[PDB]
Amino acid sequence: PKSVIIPAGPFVPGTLADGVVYVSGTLAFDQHNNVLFADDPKAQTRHVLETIRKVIETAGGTMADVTFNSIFITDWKNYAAINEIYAEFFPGDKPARFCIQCGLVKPDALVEIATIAHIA
């Protein structure tokens, strides 16, 4: 049966089943679910990927285990900035991904990422 993954600190941050980690769509939220870094896509992207990494790590994996990222943005003018930070977190062989533009849960949010990883 699935394990939930809740790093020290109606969905959980991630789940683990049969060696597959599913990380929830993650935004740049403070502890009160307010958006951090309102007008700054680079710092939002960094905060998101740091959270995702901690979920995967809590499960026993690393970012190299990520097979797929689902990226959701609100403006294509931010794509270059988001990509720049994203690449820093995946230095080796890159995951597969999509990046689509849509609406996100809070008005200041500029990016959200959900992630699938295969761990040992």
The set of residues, in sequence order, having a beta carbon less than 8 Å from that of 28 and lying 6+ positions away, is 35, 36, 37, 43, 44, 45, 47, 48, 109, 110, 111
Residue whose CB is less far from a second copy, 54 or 72 = 72
CA distance 15 to 3: 6
Q: According to CB under 8 A, which residues from 76 to 105 bind a second copy?
A: 76, 79, 83, 86-87, 90, 93-105
Return residues touching a second copy (CB under 8 A). Answer: 1-2, 4, 10-15, 17-20, 22-25, 64-68, 70, 72, 76, 79, 83, 86-87, 90, 93-105, 112, 114, 116, 118-120
